């Protein structure tokens, strides 16, 4: 009832995932740089990206308003003759 009877298909699925993650273990035991070599190599891009975020956040303001848009509303009574 409460206990189950783990099938063979489930074992094979679990072994598939175990193998994938063992490959993941392998592809992470060889980094291109070290802790000290990497330090700073991305500073310029990070600074520029955050400055882009800042310039976006500090640009909010109401949109312009044109006389043409206001006077176009008189078209709602345009007639032939």
């Amino acid at each position: 009832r409460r206990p189950r009877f783990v099938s063979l298909r489930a074992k094979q699925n679990m072994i598939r995932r175990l193998e994938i993650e063992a490959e993941n273990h392998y592809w992470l035991s060889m980094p291109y740089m070290t802790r000290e070599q990497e330090r700073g190599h991305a500073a310029v891009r990070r600074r520029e990206a955050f400055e882009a975020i800042k310039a976006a956040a500090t640009s909010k303001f109401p949109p312009h308003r044109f006389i043409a848009d206001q006077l176009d509303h008189l078209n709602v009574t345009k007639k032939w003759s």
Binding site: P3, R4, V6, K11, M14, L18
Partner: peptide, 30 residues
């Protein structure tokens, strides 16, 4: 002898000991 969570059950099943097959069967060879 309580029941185990199902995933612990699968983990116990997949990691079950598998013994090394003997090269020859002792009955038909010493």
């Amino acid at each position: 002898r309580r029941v185990m969570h199902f995933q612990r059950q699968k983990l116990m099943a997949v990691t079950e000991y598998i013994p090394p097959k003997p090269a020859i069967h002792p009955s038909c060879l010493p």
